[PDB]
Amino acid sequence: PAKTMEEASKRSYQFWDTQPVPKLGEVVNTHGPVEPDKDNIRQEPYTLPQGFTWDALDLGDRGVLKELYTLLNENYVEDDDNMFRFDYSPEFLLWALRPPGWLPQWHCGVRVVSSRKLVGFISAIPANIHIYDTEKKMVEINFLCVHKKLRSKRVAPVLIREITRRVHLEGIFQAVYTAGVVLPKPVGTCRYWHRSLNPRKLIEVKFSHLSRNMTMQRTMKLYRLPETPKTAGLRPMETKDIPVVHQLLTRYLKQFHLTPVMSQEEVEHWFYPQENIIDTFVVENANGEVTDFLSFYTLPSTIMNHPTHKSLKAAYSFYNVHTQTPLLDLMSDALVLAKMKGFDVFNALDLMENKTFLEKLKFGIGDGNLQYYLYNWKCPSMGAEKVGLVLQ
């Protein structure tokens, strides 16, 4: 894999060259599908290597959900240095994988025939996506994972072709996804920034480093936060707020070029607070009107090979909508709330308007990139500030 465009220029893409995506070299000046919709779809699953079998995972079965939890906990995305690994909780996986419209055949597992061990996974969820001047029903692809012992045997192309086939059967021909690797061809390139909330732990586990010109005591003062948020009328989102949160989000997202189009039921699913999964706080003003909201989701990482610290508690910026409260003040309060809730670090991308507050709120730039991709859709690339889509 290539994590920089430089390394990707020298690479050859034996699988992705076969797929309806633009080539890494060319510039795109068109808008539309790479190839027309297929009107006959392969009925049979693609063939796996001998000894492995497809199994659709019923995540409503607690035992099967735990198997998926364990596959990802042991084999999912690590940082560049193999020090941290995502640790999606079972309840988070239910949130991410059973939104409105979820389908069981889109929870696509691979098992060893003899032992029944779960060794592979890929998922699709439906989403309406606004890309420039087009709204398209698409899927979001997530949680592609191959067991470490199965790596480099080209199982991932089979997983991708099989989820593609299963999505084609439902009449959907475009997809959106992110990756830390460079593939043909990014529609936008984003970067994670990190806001330290627990500097001592972050430095101990080498998530962050102590600046050579700074001492620990000074570093802890640099990152100290108020005990309580400052914005008048900030409170957790409630059921009665679902319509106005939907309204605020829909109007706020029109300014970006890659965004979700959420129904009111989807807004309920993605924003209604669930402890240790998703937090949403609204600003209810002196007239009783909701004018702003902030949100962040919970995604810890395993700290590998460490005798004392085992997990890094991380909050991820989700969607933050401002119409009367300054975005800077909203995000300051998100930091205070995350600190109150025990998070070690607050993460945010440089997309939407986030660059307006990242440096001011003492975020530090992270390593690597988060590339955004469309499958079977040709359009010009865009700057990070025009990406208005956040995936789990």
Place this chain on the structure above:
Amino acid sequence: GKQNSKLR
């Protein structure tokens, strides 16, 4: 499909 980032 996320990327695991830490501080540069």
